[PDB]
Design a protein around this ligand. Structure first.
Ligand SMILES: Nc1ncnc2c1ncn2[C@@H]1O[C@@H](COP(=O)(O)OP(=O)(O)O)[C@@H](O)[C@H]1O
Ligand SMILES: Nc1ncnc2c1ncn2[C@@H]1O[C@@H](COP(=O)(O)OP(=O)(O)O)[C@H](O)[C@H]1O
Ligand code: BEF
Ligand code: BEF
Lengths: 544, 73, 525, 514
């Protein structure tokens, strides 16, 4: 035995046991969320071991709440949160593909295949797989009509699926209508998105979109107006923190002979108000700071009937000022010598009304100089849902962005993942020999998804998938069209149906970034045969 | 159970009178909707089936309408 | 700082009270727990669940009356519906699932009625008045020609459905052995005589049925036993074969040499004397049932006489009823009017085990027979004897007139009843209407439960059956091995009538007890 | 509240998959031992088990598995050694491999066990036919048909290097009993002697045993002797019932003494009047009992093991007679050609050579107390494959051959029968390659090239072609001395699959407490 090194707490598994422990560890994190995907799929609830719950159908967020014990599992969790960065949706699915790739890969080396051969059998099947995407996604460049379809397909297999068509547009419209920027000669929609809130209580369907931002804040002093509308309003996003003023540190104050301690006491406050007025004198319909206004400096912004908001969200006053044409001012001084302020700093909106939403109230900002402001204020039964409703939002808004930032889209619904299944094996198997058996499993591993889309329905679905096969295989082989292929799964009603004929549609990007990373993960684990795991640092527990 | 006890205050703030009732309805709403889960095909067919419900019901809930003078309150 | 609510009325140690309505909601669910576990068990196309004894033994069955037999429950309410199935399996072989299935459902559907506004007393009378109508209506819903019992013709037709229910797929071959072991009992008949003996080795399809019981034992007398004969006449008796031992106090005292020098001989004398006496009678085989003496065993081996070691007191009987002889205490004094002829008493070995048998009869033909079940799994071979005992109980009912009345099983009847029971409550004024329309839909179990087993979209199977009231027999059912809804008449599938009646009663009886109780005062430890 | 706290339950896909993939465990361990490049295992149960038997049963008994869907394999095996000697290991392989290939459908489904169950239930009985088609008794019929059917069995065991000896060893003893045309498989006796070697194993053509003694002056050997199977105690064993001798008078005691002496004195003389050379009894005579018989030149016997003496009469034709005073002259056994006491190891065996006698006792010698036993169990798997080779002169062309042939059959039928029954048909079909798989993986020669080239050929002919690693590559196992009795391959599939469905007939599993 051994001696080897080093125990205790430091151990290592070898060859078979690892290649297995790795696969088990992957099917683990995988098989949990293998129910989620597909319209037929459901949501789950995770317990904060302190009672607190959290209902969610998202695969990414769901795996995070799992805790990811072990290297192989956490590796998938890491691959998950990658997908949101690429896309935003499909996290639930990407994990599956990967897991299935290992599952099968190992089931090959368990057949004494050897990993090197396999790791290439994917390396190739992957490239050719994208070469087939070149035939599918391209036809999906031309087909606002098909944008509401993509935003809708991002609703199914989700809570907001029941109100899909309704929120399908609330999603599209804010980004399409009011959310466009431009940096260094590039046009793109907010990959950081547009403020979305949640309204406790109220109706499901009645989630109010807004023709402006929805800064979540309350009026500084009650004495201020609760609304200032009409047209051409004076907005001011001032991060000056115009509250008070204390001596500059390191600049101590020792007085004498006076009898002048008072001659500057007020002078400390004066310089504050002097700057406050200098700004109020340029517009001051609404003032929005980040640091906050002071009681002794609110009375001044109050008497003038100027709405003032104490300490706002810095990430907001930016997006707000960018739409109203204003300029989020940092320091008062502008060149030297300057106080200063210029009416050229203020913004341009229509209404600044502080609305109400069930025991709560937030200030809205409707209309802007540049018409780019959108804020969707959800509203449902409990926080437990109103939050998850947002998850379907953050995960659907994305699917659109990625789409509108890449002309190419793809017929989802198990369609693509079905064509590849037939296409590579029937047509990839030119090399043959052993490498063939590898490519094969790489294609077979793809069926994993279409399968679970069906198994999600209690009813025997072994056949519904069998049909999706013969159909898709029909595009070429075997033994001027009209092309009889391109169909897909209609989970809602059993039997195949053309997906393009339906609202269903997933961005090509998503079908790539996920197909690609699912491989690297798989590979990286294939190369594994020994996991040395050394114990951490124990407590001193010194007998002396 | 923690989601229900939440609808209580979830409702009280919005109108502030349907305290006792919303819970009594929310609950019984599932009891007489349960045997249609297993005997029913899925939990999602019931979802869509509920929209056509709340929609129609809110309508009927509007039929029985009265006008407030704004003394008589 | 406080606070703390005191205790309203005290008592001893700890006791558990249960408000009746609350208990009904609460205990009606406990009941409901073992329901979803018994649903998947009933019917052929179903499933079997393993159970590990409190002693560690492993058990697998389809029978729901056994699932509970191996199950240690705590719920005083569930205890009832368990006592039901168990209090039936003994009286009537099959039908143990229709017990739980209905019972559970009856409670399940009664809930709606209890919540609507009804009262337990109202609910009871409701159901009850249905049990009297459902029992009678069925007494005529038969239409299944009460076939007369002869040979294997009618037997195999009935004994199959009783078997194809759990051990599906071996229905044919299985029941074959059953009916086989049956027709070896010349027709009042005793069910108990057909014993079963399973021995490991080969596949189940290699099992056989011999006219006479099998002994997993070797013939005594060592290498001095024949272990092979031809048409030998046997003689079985209990009393110990050895010397006549003093039942009370008794020893052996000797005074002088002549005594000792001869006492040793005296034994030898009596020994041979006793033996040869019984041997001359033409006795070709002595089946010892109690005690064996080596002292006198010296004699029996030499002439050429067999010797079957001492079985159990209860096994000697079923044996004797094969040979034709009769047991008789005290050694010697054999009576030819108490002797019996046995065809063959050879020593064959299956699975490599030394075994003696009584197989085949020229001959006198045994009154009791045993089935030899070869298999590969201790567990399966056990849940095969069960599917057999079920059958042996179905032939026990057909043997007592006039229970030999068939009936459209396979859900057929359990579906027609749906409407037939509806009408009764459809035309009975009062609040009891509801309590009846419920008892009716309660029978939705058997229908759906069959469909859900095969993956059949239950939402289609039910509607189809409703359309198919055909009244041809019916004439209408569901076979998991086809498309849409099948036809009972065709498959030759029909469940014996009386079994259903017993099931429909014991359930409506048990379900009523559970409904009847209002408060449960459970103790502790 | 029920259920009782606490007893585990797995409802759902759990037990459905955590029983097949759990049975796969034990089925993943043994899957290395089989065929020419065998992998024998060693294991230390509680206490110094220190046992190394390649008998798949013998192995699956020591694992003492606790899992239900696993103890099924420790059962599906245990049976084998009841019907057919060898093959015990190969059953589990398929028994599990079936369960294994049942996972793919069962998981991407949406498919109830009942479907899969009967789906294989057909394929099984389908394969059972093809087998019953291949065996042919007996083209070149010879008494060597059994001999070479054993070299297929002993092959790749802890005796293969020295096997051609342990081959003729097995056959001989088998053909000593009247089982030809019925006779037990017990009469051959396997004895364990300490020191020695496999090659130094003696095939006594008679009997063998050792016994306690009280005086060695007896004759150590006698040619063509007279053997009495007495079965009595002669020292002075007290009467069964409470035997007592109350006395009266002064000069009576001695009378009783000389009487007691007389009683036994006579019995002893009685033995003499039989003219024996060696008295063999199953009970104890020590002291004067030996003394006298030894003076007469007869090696007395301590009671001889129960199953021991029961061999001696048959070999010697004698009949054990518990009575001494009625001993006939036609009850003795002289068949013994030469009875000596040739000491071996640290012990001393009394061998009754010579024959017309049924129990061909084998005194197997060994070099290690853990190996002598690994050889014993390495002949139990042989003597039985011989016994069955006799009972049914029908021989299956084994060596992964009968498997590769059955596969093509099942695979043939499945295509015509397309549907949700095609996959499960192509299941037992594919899974039938379980054997030829690691059968080669154990060796080393590439398996994938081998079967991808074995199928590609066996498919176009070569019905009885297996994988013979003697020369690498594969060829018709029918030509070489590769013969496996029919019952083995047949019965095994029906059995391995019997559980390969039972474990699918499982819904959930409910436990207990201690
Ligand atoms: N072809 C068939 N043969 C036998 N039984 C069938 C057949 N088809 C359906 N069944 C079902 O099998 C019987 C009931 O199953 P069973 O496990 O015996 O319940 P129980 O023994 O408690 O009555 C039928 O009455 C029916 O519902
Ligand atoms: N000459 C051979 N070449 C290759 N394999 C062989 C040869 N002879 C026998 N075998 C294999 O070994 C045998 C299977 O035995 P197995 O159940 O695996 O363990 P054991 O022989 O101990 O019972 C078969 O005959 C065959 O599969
Ligand atoms: F279900 Be029955 F008792 F066979
Ligand atoms: F090891 Be063999 F299968 F008996």
């Amino acid at each position: 035995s051994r001696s080897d090194t080093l125990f205790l707490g430091g151990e290592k598994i070898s060859g078979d046991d690892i290649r297995n422990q790795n696969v088990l560890a992957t099917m683990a994190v995988a098989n949990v969320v293998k129910s989620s995907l597909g319209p037929v799929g459901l949501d789950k609830m995770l317990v904060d071991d302190i009672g607190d719950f959290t209902v969610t159908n998202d695969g990414a967020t769901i795996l995070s709440l799992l805790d990811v014990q072990h290297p192989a599992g956490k590796i998938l969790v890491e691959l998950a949160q990658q997908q949101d960065r690429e896309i935003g949706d499909g996290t639930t699915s990407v994990v599956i593909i990967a897991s299935e790739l290992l599952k099968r890969a190992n089931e090959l080396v368990k057949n004494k295949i050897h990993p090197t051969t396999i790791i290439t059998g994917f390396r190739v099947a992957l490239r050719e797989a994208i070469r087939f995407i070149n035939e599918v996604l391209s036809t999906s460049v031309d087909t606002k009509e098909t944008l509401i379809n993509i935003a809708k397909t991002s609703m199914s297999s989700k809570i907001i699926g029941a109100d899909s068509d309704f929120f399908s547009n609330m999603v599209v419209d804010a980004l399409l209508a009011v959310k466009t920027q431009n940096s260094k000669g590039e046009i793109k929609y907010p990959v950081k998105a547009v403020n979305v809130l949640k309204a406790h209580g109220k109706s499901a369907t009645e989630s109010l979109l807004v023709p402006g931002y929805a800064l979540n804040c309350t009026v500084a002093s009650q004495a201020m107006p609760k609304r200032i509308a009409g047209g051409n309003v004076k907005i001011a996003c001032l991060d000056l923190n115009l509250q008070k003023a204390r001596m500059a540190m390191g600049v101590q104050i020792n007085i004498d002979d006076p009898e002048q301690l008072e001659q500057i006491r007020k002078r400390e406050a004066g310089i504050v108000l002097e700057r406050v007025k200098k700004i109020i004198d340029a517009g001051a319909q609404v003032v929005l700071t980040t640091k906050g206004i002071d009681d002794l400096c609110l009375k001044e912004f109050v008497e003038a009937k100027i709405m003032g908001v104490r300490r706002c969200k810095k990430e907001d006053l930016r997006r707000i000022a960018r739409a109203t044409g204003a300029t989020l001012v940092s320091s008062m001084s502008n060149l030297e010598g300057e106080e200063t302020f210029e009416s050229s700093y203020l913004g341009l909106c229509d209404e600044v009304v502080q609305a109400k939403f069930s025991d709560d109230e937030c200030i809205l900002i409707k209309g802007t100089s540049k018409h780019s402001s959108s804020s969707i204020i959800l509203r449902g039964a409990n926080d437990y849902s109103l939050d998850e409703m947002e998850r379907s939002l953050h995960d659907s808004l994305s699917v659109v962005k990625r789409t509108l930032e890449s002309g190419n889209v793809v017929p989802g619904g198990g369609c693509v993942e079905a064509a590849l299944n037939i296409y590579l094996d029937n047509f990839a198997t030119t090399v043959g020999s052993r490498e063939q058996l590898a490519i094969a499993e790489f294609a077979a591993a793809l069926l994993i998804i279409p399968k679970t889309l069906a198994v999600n329905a209690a009813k025997d679905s072994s056949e519904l998938v069998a049909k999706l096969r013969s159909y898709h295989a029909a595009s070429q082989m075997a033994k001027k069209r009209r092309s009889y292929r391109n169909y897909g799964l209609d989970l809602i009603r059993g039997k195949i149906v053309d997906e393009i004929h339906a609202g269903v549609l997933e961005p090509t990007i998503s079908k790539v970034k996920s197909l690609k990373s699912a491989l690297e993960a798989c590979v990286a684990i294939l190369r594994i045969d020994t996991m040395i795991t050394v114990d951490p640092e124990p407590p001193k527990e010194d007998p002396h | 159970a923690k989601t229900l006890v939440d609808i209580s205050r979830a409702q009280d703030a919005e109108v502030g009178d349907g305290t006792t009732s919303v819970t009594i309805l929310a609950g019984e709403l599932m009891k007489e909707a349960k045997p249609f889960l297993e005997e029913g095909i899925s939990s999602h067919l019931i979802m869509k089936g509920y929209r056509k419900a709340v929609s129609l019901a809110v309508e009927k809930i509007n039929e029985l309408a009265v006008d407030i003078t704004s003394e008589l309150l | 700082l406080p606070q703390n609510p005191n205790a309203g009325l005290f008592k001893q140690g700890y006791n558990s009270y249960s408000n009746a309505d609350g208990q009904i909601i609460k205990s009606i669910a406990a009941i409901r727990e073992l329901h979803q576990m018994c649903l998947t068990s009933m019917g052929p196309c179903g499933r079997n669940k393993i159970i590990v004894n409190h002693l560690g033994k492993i058990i697998i069955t389809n029978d729901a009356a056994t699932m509970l037999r191996e199950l240690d429950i705590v719920h005083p309410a569930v205890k009832v519906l368990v006592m039901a199935t168990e209090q039936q399996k003994i009286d009537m072989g099959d039908g143990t699932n229709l017990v739980m299935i209905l019972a559970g459902e009856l409670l399940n559907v009664s809930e709606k009625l209890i919540s609507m506004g009804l009262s337990a007393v109202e609910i009871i009378q409701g159901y009850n008045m249905a049990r009297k109508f459902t029992l009678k209506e069925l007494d005529e819903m038969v239409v299944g020609e009460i076939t007369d019992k002869n040979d294997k013709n009618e037997l195999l037709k009935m004994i199959k459905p009783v078997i194809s229910s759990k051990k599906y797929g071996s229905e044919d071959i299985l029941s074959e052995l059953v009916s086989e072991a049956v027709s070896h009992v010349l027709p009042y008949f005793n069910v108990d005589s057909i014993r079963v003996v399973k021995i490991m080795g080969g596949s189940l399809s290699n099992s056989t049925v011999i006219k006479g019981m099998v002994f997993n034992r070797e013939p005594e007398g060592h290498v001095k036993s024949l272990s092979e004969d031809k048409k030998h006449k046997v003689a079985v008796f209990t009393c110990p074969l050895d010397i006549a031992n003093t039942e009370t106090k008794g020893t052996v005292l000797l005074h002088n040499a002549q005594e000792m020098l001869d006492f040793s001989k005296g034994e030898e004398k009596q020994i041979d004397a006793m033996m040869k006496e019984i041997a001359d009678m033409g006795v070709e085989c002595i089946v010892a049932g109690a005690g064996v003496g080596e002292l006198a065993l010296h004699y029996l081996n030499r002439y050429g006489i067999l010797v079957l070691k001492v079985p159990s007191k209860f096994e000697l009987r079923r044996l004797c009823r094969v040979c034709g002889a009769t047991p008789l205490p005290r050694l010697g004094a054999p009576t030819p009017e108490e002797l019996g002829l046995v065809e063959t008493v050879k020593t064959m070995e299956i699975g490599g085990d030394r075994v003696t048998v009584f197989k085949q009869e020229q001959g006198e033909i045994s009154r009791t027979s045993t089935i030899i079940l070869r298999g590969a799994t201790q567990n399966n071979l056990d849940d095969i004897e069960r599917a057999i005992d079920d059958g042996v109980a179905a032939v026990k009912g057909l043997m007592k007139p006039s229970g030999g009345k068939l009936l459209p099983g396979a859900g057929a009847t359990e579906i027609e009843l749906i409407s037939r029971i509806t009408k009764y409550g459809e035309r009975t004024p009062g609040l009891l209407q509801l309590a009846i329309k419920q008892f009716a839909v309660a029978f939705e179990v058997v229908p759906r439960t069959l469909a859900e087993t095969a993956g059949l979209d239950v939402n289609e199977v039910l509607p189809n059956l409703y359309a198919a009231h055909n009244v041809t027999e019916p004439g209408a059912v569901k076979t998991d091995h086809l498309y849409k809804g099948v036809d009972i008449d065709g498959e030759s599938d029909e469940g014996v009538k009386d079994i259903r009646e017993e099931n429909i009663y014991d359930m409506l009886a048990t379900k009523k007890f559970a409904i009847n109780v209002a408060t449960e005062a459970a103790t502790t430890v | 509240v029920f259920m009782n706290a606490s007893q585990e339950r797995t409802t759902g896909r759990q037990a459905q998959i955590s029983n097949i993939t759990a049975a796969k465990a034990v089925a993943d361990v043994i899957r290395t031992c089989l065929g020419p490049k065998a992998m024998l295992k060693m294991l230390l149960d509680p206490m110094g088990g220190l046992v190394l038997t390649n008998d798949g049963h013998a192995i699956l008994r020591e694992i003492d598995v606790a899992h239900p869907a696993a103890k099924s394999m420790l059962e599906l095996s245990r049976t084998q050694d009841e019907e057919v000697g060898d093959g015990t290991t190969t059953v589990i392989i398929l028994a599990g491999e079936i369960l294994a290939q049942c996972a793919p459908y069962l998981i991407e489904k949406n498919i109830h066990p009942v479907i899969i169950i009967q789906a294989l239930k057909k394929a099984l009985t389908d394969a059972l036919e093809v087998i019953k088609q291949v065996s042919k008794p007996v083209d070149v019929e010879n008494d060597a048909a059994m001999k070479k059917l054993i070299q297929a069995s002993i092959g790749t065991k802890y005796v293969i290097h020295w096997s051609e000896k342990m081959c003729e060893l097995a056959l001989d003893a088998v053909k000593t009993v009247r089982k030809d045309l019925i006779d037990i498989k017990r009469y051959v006796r396997v004895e364990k002697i300490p020191g020695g070697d496999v090659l130094d194993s003696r095939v006594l053509k008679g009997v063998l045993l050792n016994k306690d003694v009280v005086h060695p002056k007896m004759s150590r050997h006698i040619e063509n002797p007279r053997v009495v199977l007495l079965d009595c105690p002669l020292e002075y064993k007290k009467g069964e019932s409470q035997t007592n001798i109350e006395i009266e008078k002064e000069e009576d005691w001695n009378r009783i003494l000389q009487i007691e002496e007389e009683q036994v004195q006579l019995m002893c003389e009685q033995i003499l009047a039989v003219r024996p050379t060696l008295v063999i009894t199953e009970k104890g005579v020590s002291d004067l009992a030996q003394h006298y018989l030894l003076k007469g030149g007869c090696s007395v016997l301590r009671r001889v093991k129960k199953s021991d003496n029961n061999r001696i009469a048959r070999v010697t034709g004698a009949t054990i007679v518990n009575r001494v005073e009625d001993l006939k002259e036609s009850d003795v056994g002289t068949n013994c050609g030469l009875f000596k006491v040739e000491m071996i190891g640290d012990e001393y065996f009394s061998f009754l050579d010579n024959g017309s006698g049924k129990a061909c006792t084998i005194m197997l010698r060994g070099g290690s107390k853990d190996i002598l036993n690994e050889i014993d169990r390495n002949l139990q798997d042989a003597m039985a494959v011989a016994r069955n080779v006799m009972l049914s002169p029908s021989l299956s062309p084994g060596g992964g051959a009968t498997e590769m042939a059955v596969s093509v059959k099942l695979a043939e039928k499945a295509k015509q029968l397309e549907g949700i029954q095609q996959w499960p048909y192509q299941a037992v079909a594919d899974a039938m390659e379980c054997i030829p798989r690691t059968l080669i993986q154990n060796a080393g020669g590439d398996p994938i090239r081998l079967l991808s080239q074995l199928r590609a050929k066996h498919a176009q002919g070569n019905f009885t072609t297996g994988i013979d690693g003697d020369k690498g590559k594969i060829v018709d196992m029918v030509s070489y001395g590769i013969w496996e009795p029919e019952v083995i391959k047949q019965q095994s599939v029906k059995t391995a699959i019997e559980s390969a469905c039972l474990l699918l007939r499982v819904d959930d599993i409910v436990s207990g407490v201690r």
